[model samples]
Every structure is written in C-alpha cells, then in structure tokens.
Target: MENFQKVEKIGEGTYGVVYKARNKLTGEVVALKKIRTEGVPSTAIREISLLKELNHPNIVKLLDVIHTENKLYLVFEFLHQDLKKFMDASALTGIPLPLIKSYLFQLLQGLAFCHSHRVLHRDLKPQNLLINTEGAIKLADFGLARAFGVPVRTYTHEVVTLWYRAPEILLGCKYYSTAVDIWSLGCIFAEMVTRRALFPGDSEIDQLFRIFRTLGTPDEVVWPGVTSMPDYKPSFPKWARQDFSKVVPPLDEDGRSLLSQMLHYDPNKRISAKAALAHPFFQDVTKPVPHLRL
Candidate 1:
C-alpha cells in the first residue's frame, strides 16, 4: 500500500473514492480504488471477484487488491477517461461515425464475452465505459453486475440508470436478464451518433413514458405478458409507432435495423451481443481505428 503514490483523484467509485496512482516499485500508472471496510461492502466483494475472473481486451483489468487496516485498495490498469467525458469533450460534433461504429463493435464484443461467462453487467452507460488514449473502449464499474445461472435467481428491476434502463425493468420485472444491458447499448449508440442523450427522462414514470413515446406503446402482441408486471399500468401516454428513419436520422438502413432490434420492447426479442456483432452493420467495416486495434 505504501509503495503507491496518489497522482490525483480519479472519481467516485461504487462505495469509495478512486484515484490515479503511480506505483513506485514498477513505475506503473494505475487506478487505485479505496474502499472502507464496514463489514465488507457487497459491491466491493462482487466487483473484486468478477474482475479477477474475467479477462478480455474490452473489459477493464483489475491488477491487484490490497487489504490493510480495514481498508481495501483495488489497483487497476489506468485508462485515459470514460465515454461520457469523451463525448462531452466532443460535444460540439459528437463522435464521428467511423469511431462510433468501431466503439459499438468493441462494446458488443466485450459484452458478448461477459454474457458467455454468465455475467450480467446490470449497469451499462457511457460513464461506465472507459476509453484509452488510443481509442480503445473498456467496460468498467461492476458495482451492480452479477453472475447468474443455475437457480436463475430473481434480480431487482431497479438496477440500471434512468435514461438507458430497459422497458421490462421499468415495468418491474424482477427476473430481468442480459437484455437489460442491451437496451443501454442501444441508448449509448444513439447518443454517440447524435451527441445527446437518446432518452433523458426525469423520473421513473417520465422515463417509461419517454420510451413508450419513442417506440410506441407496447401491447400483448409485441411483448408477451408485459401487462402482468408488478409495475405495469393500464394507461400510458399515447405515442405513435417507431419510425427509425426519423428517430435515428444519421444511421444507415442496416444500422437502423440493428438499433431497432436492440431496442425491442420484449427482452426476449432484444438482440444478443454476439448476434449484434454479426449484424450487417459491421459487414462493410473494413478498417479498424489504429487506437482501437480490437
């Protein structure tokens, strides 16, 4: 613990302060997440165990862990910044199309790996996606993530952020799945193209309404058992059916097709990360950005 020198404050983590640190012994720059042990925070335990087992290019790497004096220090390979800050810096024009395609490709690739391992990243947004100077994107922040299988445990629908939350979750589906993350990816992909949030709702009610307005109200036909959820309401603000051409103006036919699949009202119908990667959207993507070698 004494071998590392704090370079600067990184940001607020799940349950503690994150900082940039320089390892005196190895001269390595790393992210040092400091968490106080008040009987071992569940989030800390989950993140540590998850990062330790998961290994992939697009997933943030957890370098080491240190425990001392009831304090836990998680050391990680430091990246340049997060997607939110990256988008903010490019606020004037938004992320370029080629870059967006490359970034989205990487996102799906990373998520596919997690899904293969039976891990669900309950939180998926621009802020949680870290980007390096070279343009490579990495998935971070596993505070709300959990590995699922076996008994198929029921999860809380209140997991993801408001803007990017999936519809099934907002309707109070306790047993949500990886489709929850897919919804967020769709919202993030839209933001990258337009330089603004796709659905910036103020509250849960407002958030659900915004989605309905954008995608049109779901029915028993589109989403089986949608009306059966605990939070399901009989009446909702009327909204016209989705017109992808106008909603995502800049996207190509194939790209728009993929986005539509990602935003489906039914979690069962949502595109899987692996399937998303195979979509024709990336068929013509010949060259990868130099920085995003993945």
Candidate 2:
C-alpha cells in the first residue's frame, strides 16, 4: 500500500475510499482500493477470488493486492468513464442503440464467463459497466458476486440497482437465478435505446404497475406460479396492451427480439446471456454498437 504514489480520490466504494494512484515502478495509472481489515470478512476476499477466476476482455482487470496491518488494498485498471457518464454525455438522456448494443454485448460476454464459472453478479447497472481507453465496455464492480446454483435461498431481492432490478426481485421473489441479471440488462438496453428509464417507479406497487402496464400482467400461462411467491401481489395500475414500437422505438427488429426475450416477465423464460450472444441481434458484431435509429 505504501509503495504506490497516492493520487486523487476517485470515489467511495463498498468498503472504503478509493484513490487513483500510480505504480512506482511501472508509472501506470491505476485504482487503489483500501478497506479496514479489522472487521473485513469474506467480501473483499470473495472479490479477489472471483477476479482471479474471471479473466475476460469485458471484465475489469485486477492488478495486485496489498496487505498490511489488518488492512487490504487492491490495485485495478482505471476506467476513464462509466455507462452513466456516457448516457449523460448523450444529452443527459439515453444513449444510441449502436453504443447500447456494443456495451451490452460486452456485458453479456463478461456475464457469460461469470455464470459459466457459477458466479452471480447480483448487482448489474450502468454504473458498473465501465469504458476503457479504446471505448470498449467492461464490467467493473464485483463486490456482490455470489456462488450460483443455490436453491430457494432467502436472499435480499435488493441486489440490483432499483431501476434495473428484475421483476422477481422487485416482487421479492427470492428463488431466482442469473436470469435476474438478464432483466437488468433488459432495462439497461431499453434505457440505451430510449435515452430514458424504461420503468422508474416510486413505490413497490407503482413499480409493479409500471412494469405490467407496459408488458401486460403476467398470467399463470406465461409465468406459471407467479402468484405463488411469498410476496406476490397484484398491481394497482391498469394493465393494458401497449404499443411495442412506442416502448422501443430505436431498437431494430432483431434488437427488439433480444430485449423482449431478456425482459420476459418469467425469470425462468428470460434469455440467458449465452443464448443472447447467439441471437442474430448480435450477428453484425464488428466491435459492437447499438442499432441507432436517429
């Protein structure tokens, strides 16, 4: 921790303050994560362990770990900007589809690797998707990655960022899977296309209604056992047929198909990241970008 030249503070993390620093030997810019080790448990260890296991083009790279006096420090490649910054740069609204597609494909590629290793991100949002010097998108924060394949465990459905949270999580359905991440991806992708939030509700009921009003109330036919969940309750808002084109005006036919599959109300039916990669929606992948409409 003392070897690196301390720079300016980047921001606060789950643990402690993060600083932008430079390596003494290499003179390269990097992020230094510092945490109070006195009460630290498996969280930082879990992040490090998972980072070691996950090495992909779209995942943030961990440079080193520094330990001293019951304290922990992690060095990582610095991301110049995040998806939030990009969206804000796009006139303080949604980003174009080409950029959206590119970012999402990168997200999927990283998520595919994580899920393959049975690691769940648990938290998926725009802020977590970072952009590098090449303008390539990568998944950054791993503070909440969990081991996958556990069944019916009572977890805080409070994992994801609110807007990107999956319906099951929104409804407090604990029995879920990596598909939850797919739901967030759906919201993020839509936000990218529309340049606005797809569903921004103030209350639980409002959130459910907002979702249902747009996607229609999910019946047992489409989502069997939807009403059987512990916190399962009906929405207050009117659930009516919505114009699909109005919901996603910027997405191409293929893009819309992918978004629909990802946003499937039934978590069981939500498209897997691997399956999404296979969709022709991503067929024209050069470096990847959204399918812009205007």
Using Cα atoms with residue i matched to residue i, what is each candidate's TM-score against the true structure?
Answer: 0.88, 0.83
Instruction: Please write out the lDDT profile of model 2 over residues 1-294, one tens digit for every residue.
Output: 557888889876544567889888899999887753254465556656556656788888877766556667777888877777677678555565556667788889888987787767666778778886565888875534453222222132222235666778767776658888888888888887887889887666677778988998877888898877667765444477576678989568898888899999888889999999999988776564432222
| Candidate 2 residue spans exceeding 4 A from truth | 35-38, 42-47, 65-67, 92-96, 143-160, 203-205, 234-238, 288-294
Candidate that would win on TM-score: 1
C-alpha RMSD of each candidate structure in angstroms? 5.0, 5.1
lDDT of 1 at 253: 93
Candidate 1 clash pair list: none
Residues 133-162 of candidate 1 have per-residue lDDT tens digits of 666889885433443211111122223347
Q: Model 1 off-target regions past 4 Å?
A: 41-47, 147-161, 286-294
Q: What is the lDDT of candidate 1?
A: 0.79
Query: What lDDT would each prediction earn against the true structure?
Result: 0.79, 0.73
